[PDB]
Amino acid sequence: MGAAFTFPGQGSQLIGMGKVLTEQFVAARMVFEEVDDALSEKLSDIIFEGPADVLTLTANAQPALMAVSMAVIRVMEQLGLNVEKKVKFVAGHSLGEYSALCAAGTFSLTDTARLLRIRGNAMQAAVAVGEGSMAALIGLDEKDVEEICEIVAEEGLCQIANDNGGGQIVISGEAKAVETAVEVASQKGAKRAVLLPVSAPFHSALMQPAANAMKNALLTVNKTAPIVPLIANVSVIPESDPERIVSLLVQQVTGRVRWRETIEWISANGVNTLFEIGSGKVLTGLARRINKDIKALTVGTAEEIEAALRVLGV
Numbered sequence: 653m654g655a656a657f658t659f660p661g662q663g664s665q666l667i668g669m670g671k672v673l674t675e676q677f678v679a680a681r682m683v684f685e686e687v688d689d690a691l692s693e694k695l696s697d698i699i700f701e702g703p704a705d706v707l708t709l710t711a712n713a714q715p716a717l718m719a720v721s722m723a724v725i726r727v728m729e730q731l732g733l734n735v736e737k738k739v740k741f742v743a744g745h746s747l748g749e750y751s752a753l754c755a756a757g758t759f760s761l762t763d764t765a766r767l768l769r770i771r772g773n774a775m776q777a778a779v780a781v782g783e784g785s786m787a788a789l790i791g792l793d794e795k796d797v798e799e800i801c802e803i804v805a806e807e808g809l810c811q812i813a814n815d816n817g818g819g820q821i822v823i824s825g826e827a828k829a830v831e832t833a834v835e836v837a838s839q840k841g842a843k844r845a846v847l848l849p850v851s852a853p854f855h856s857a858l859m860q861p862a863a864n865a866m867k868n869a870l871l872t873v874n875k876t877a878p879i880v881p882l883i884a885n886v887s888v889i890p891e892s893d894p895e896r897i898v899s900l901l902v903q904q905v906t907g908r909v910r911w912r913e914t915i916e917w918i919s920a921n922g923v924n925t926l927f928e929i930g931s932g933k934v935l936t937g938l939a940r941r942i943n944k945d946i947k948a949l950t951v952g953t954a955e956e957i958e959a960a961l962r963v964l965g966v
C-alpha cells in the first residue's frame with residue numbers, strides 16, 4: 653500500500669547536516685541560500701560548522717531542520733517525485749509540522765523559514781530563565797505519567813509534552829514540579845527519568861506567549877490548503893483546511909505532541925511505509941518501536957533519496 657512522509661523536530665539537528673547534499677545538488681543548495689536570504693543571516697554557516705550549542709538554540713534549530721528537510725524534498729522533486737500523486741499523508745514532530753506544510757505547498761519556503769524563526773524566538777523568550785524544565789521518561793504509560801503530573805500539582809505545573817511511542821514520554825512545566833516528577837517517576841520504576849533543568853518548557857501552558865506570537869504571525873502569511881493532508885500533532889486526523897490548520901498550529905505550542913497516536917493512525921489507514929525526510933534517524937527509531945510491521949526508512953542522503961524514489965515507484 654501507501655506511503656507517508658514524516659518530518660523531524662528539535663533534537664534531530666547535527667553539525668554539517670545538509671552540506672553534502674548541497675554539494676551534490678543545486679536543488680538542495682538553493683534551499684539553504686533562500687533560507688539564509690529569508691532570515692537575513694548566514695544561518696547555513698551555523699548549520700554546516702556549528703558550534704553545536706549555537707545550532708541547538710531553538711531559534712536556529714527550527715529553521716535549520718526545516719531547510720534540511722526541504723532540501724531533500726526539492727532534490728526528490730527534481731528527480732521526479734510528485735508528492736500529491738505518491739504520498740498519502742504528511743506529518744511532522746512539532747517544528748516538523750511546518751516542514752510538512754511547506755512540502756505540501758501550504759506555505760512558501762521563505763515564509764516557512766520566517767515562521768520558524770518567529771516560533772523559535774518566541775519559545776526561547778516565553779518564560780524567564782530557570783523557571784521551566786522538561787524531562788525525558790521511559791517505561792511509564794501515559795495514564796501513570798498523568799497521575800504523576802497530578803501528584804506534583806502542589807509544587808507547580810507539570811504536563812505531558814510528547815507521547816513518542818516505545819514507552820517514551822516527555823514532560824514539561826515549572827522547574828520544581830518537573831524535578832519532583834522525575835523523582836516520582838524513578839520511584840515508580842521508570843527505566844529512564846532524566847531532568848533537562850534549563851530547557852524551555854515546550855508544549856506546556858507556560859508557552860502561552862509563544863502561542864500568541866504564532867497566532868499573529870500565522871494570520872498574515874499567505875497560505876493554501878496542503879496538497880495532501882497533514883496529520884496534525886493536536887488532532888491526529890487528516891487536516892486540509894488552512895484556517896483550521898492555523899488554529900491547530902497555535903494550539904500545538906502549548907499542547908501535547910501526539911506522536912505515538914499519529915504513527916498508529918497512519919499505519920492503520922492505508923500506509924505501510926513511513927519515510928523520515930531530512931536530518932537523522934530519530935523518527936525512524938520511534939516508528940520501529942511503535943509498529944514492528946511497517947517499513948520505516950530514512951531519507952537524508954543521495955543514496956536514500958534514490959531508494960525512496962524506487963519504493964514510491966517514481
Ligand SMILES: [Cl-]
Pocket residue numbers: 662663664708
Ligand atoms: Cl535538542
